[PDB]
Symmetry: D2
């Protein structure tokens, strides 16, 4: 019996949680019947959806027997809009702890991209006994780069996109965002544009929160030694939103870290080399 | 009496050089009559002229008594336009050899910028007898950076400006060019744009030369150990046109090097901190 | 129904080559009857037979069905002793071309470590047709390091060992190689010691070749872009013999390279991590 | 008249401090009578003293006319011995604050070396109003180096020297310090040897402090943005005790920071290039 493809509408559920004395409804997607579960977090992209980001990766995890949970972070997608001057990673970790408490599983595996990856690290710090295995891509710590000047051009273009939504500006930020532009298709363009224009509240909330607090990802350097679980970091050399050197710092921090670099890969690696990344992550998960 | 600021009109001089069996006219300026002599090169910018680049540096060098020669390479300023299919740096070196032979000066100090710095290094490789000192600002080696993606954004903006020169792309390039825009004034803009609109043959020649061969600057790494003269490097950290790592490479090669870096700096370093740069260079030159 | 591992005595083979009007006897090992042929190059450690370095990795490859040719370059083991004024790279490349020509195999996949890796690159340069896939382990490019002083202490202790051959020097050498010295056993110490004691002539030839040329491994920087085959690079972070940053430089040159770095690994990567390295190499080879 | 070179005996002073409910006696040297004050802090070498490290630099500073004070940290020189399981940097900050409060000078400029440099950073955080100008040499921040394995060569030999005292290891240490040992003279050898043999208590206290607490110096990364005064960092390229990259990290921390690197210079930088370092420091201090 060959595994049938999944659809975002089919797997959609919602849960309301009480945090900081306020209610918040979070959308999430659960698939698979396997005992072992894997958590996925989306990036910080405009109108980015958890199902949208991981369109290629959802399958090999489900044929391998892993039950997969995709978490739509608050302030993105179908989750309720929120304004926060505080750290995004801390809030994301709190929300994830709440949702896993409702789901009632103790040990989980984390795979987070960009902002979520940041939050992922945060989680492992302040409830370490929960996480089993850790994978990062294009993030893990927000700090000044050593050689490549900050702010990078990708961040400036993304802020330009938030301040004024425009399809041509979206085309620009996609083109800089991904190294190999040939694979880009108009279907993704229109879907992303529709999603981002539909939710104006998230965009204005992000702008206001950025104005409120200049920094959203604090430095986590001195505490990196605290992590004990095995970790793997994947990165792209031609990534322009965040420089390579940041990943190297993480390679120093964690005792068992192993880094994997592609020669010509953009920020959004899982799309560039889906097969290699999927096989590597599956082998890492199967590694005893 | 204080040394009067120099005027290009009074100090203008022209010379004839036979390169590749072709007659060419070269423009330059000479100031001072002291025994010690120095040559000043110019950058690779649109319509860049040595006088515009070195307005602040030109006075103290004359004040110290050094004879100064500001040299304009072909393809810029009043020199004859030319289309290149090989290595630009060697061609500049040959022209500089011809002009110094006509001046018949034995000992000479070289201070090159960006592509001009390239030329200087190439020159020093062939004729170590003639060169006494080297001061390199923002260039001197052609190679792929360790941690910064290529092609970098700055050269991309420069190329698109050459593709069609206009006021708004000039504003954008100037904004990215220098770290601070407060002290910037419109007089520099008007002078640069009038020098641009004066000649279009230079711009079209540059474009056809670039499209003829993708690389016009060779890699001098393996032989860079041949230089015996003491040298100094000044570099900019936040510079986006050429990454800092490449500069570090130069440091490793030469026996007597000294690297100097400013944090709040761009490509065009000498203008941003004129006092510190002049003090450092004069101290290095007077050093026995 | 796995076949028991083969012995050196059964797999020993001898070929004769002529170079520069001299007769050289080359001793190597050949195993497996598969169509695909993989050449294994020995390390630069004193008294290091090719079989010693790759004892663990032979079995999985031959079990997968790959034909393996483990080569001993001149100057080690049972091969004839030589003194070379030129580089080791081109010399080993020529010898390997000669031996494969006697073996008349159309295509090979190269696995190189330390010295061999260097030569491996040289091979791919000047006979591109024979090589299709390239794997490097902690070496393969000459040239001095940007961030690490030279001579690095590993090379210093290696030369000291060549000058004073003794057991305690071998102990210290093993101390710097492997991150954790616990895994080593006395059997390896005695085997390496008696092996290196058997052939002093190799020692005198190597040392007087060292006085022949201070630098024996040329840098391939400018030519690095000429390689067209896909490549995998494995490296160690705690490596002291060859600095980590050099590996990054290789990533720049190759068209589609992949860099893999382990957190706690020395010069001798294959021995320390067995399952992960074997699986990675097998997947990379099988992957088109 | 020529200003007389200073003598240790005439300028020696002893003052008292309270720390952790204990009375400590500290030895320092005072020179000059200028209103402006500069404080010099010594290194971490065994038996090293404030006067020894700055012997070549002390004279030009008083020649300019600035008042200068050489400080001996607890556990070094004639100061009372102490054991610290906690951080050293804060302890030196407290001692310097107390001594300057007794000497009651409002504005002070700091020059630090190795461990002292680290302490200097701490001071600028605690009492930013007092520090006017800041210069560092080879240190200032803890944490794992990105490109170099730890513990490195020099720190390991240093631990060896503290564990067991002798003269041959003293030659080895001087060999690791200096680029060229020909300049150094055995008079310094015997001075250092008698100094370190005279006081076994300091050696024992250092050993116990290291064995009690692994990390002596913390990382000050996240708060580096708090410093506002101008800084000058001087470093040596072949440094073996602490790699180059750390300096670059400080180059990111301070907004107005300035970096200077010598191509061929050991850890004990100021002795190796007396004239250049003195001239640079006088230029930096005189600059308004």
């Amino acid at each position: 019996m060959s595994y049938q493809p999944q659809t975002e509408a089919a797997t959609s559920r919602f849960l309301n949680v009480e945090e900081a004395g306020k209610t918040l409804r979070i959308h999430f997607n659960d698939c698979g019947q396997g005992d072992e579960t894997v958590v996925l977090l989306h990036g910080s992209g405009p109108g980015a959806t958890g199902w949208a980001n991981f369109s290629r990766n959802i399958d090999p995890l489900v044929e391998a027997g892993y039950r997969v949970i995709l978490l739509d972070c608050p302030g993105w997608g179908k989750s309720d809009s929120v304004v926060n001057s505080g750290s995004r990673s801390d809030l994301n970790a709190r929300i994830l702890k709440s949702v896993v408490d409702q789901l009632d599983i103790a040990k989980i595996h984390l795979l987070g991209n960009s902002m979520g990856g940041h939050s992922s690290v945060a989680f492992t710090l302040k409830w370490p006994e929960r996480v089993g295995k850790l994978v990062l891509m294009g993030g893990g710590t927000g700090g000044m780069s050593l050689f490549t000047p900050m702010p990078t051009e990708g961040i400036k273009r993304l802020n330009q996109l938030y301040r004024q939504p425009t399809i041509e500006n979206l085309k620009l930020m996609m083109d800089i965002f991904v190294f190999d532009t040939s694979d880009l298709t108009d279907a993704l363009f229109e879907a992303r544009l529709n999603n981002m224009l539909s939710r104006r509240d998230h965009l204005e909330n992000f702008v206001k929160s950025l104005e409120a607090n200049p920094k959203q990802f604090p430095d986590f350097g001195p505490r990196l030694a605290e992590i004990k679980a095995q970790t793997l970091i994947v990165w792209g050399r031609n990534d322009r939103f965040v420089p390579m050197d940041a990943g190297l710092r993480l390679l120093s921090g964690i005792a068992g870290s192993e880094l994997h670099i592609f020669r010509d890969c953009g920020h959004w690696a899982q799309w560039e080399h889906a097969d290699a990344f999927n096989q590597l992550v599956l082998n890492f998960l199967a590694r005893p």
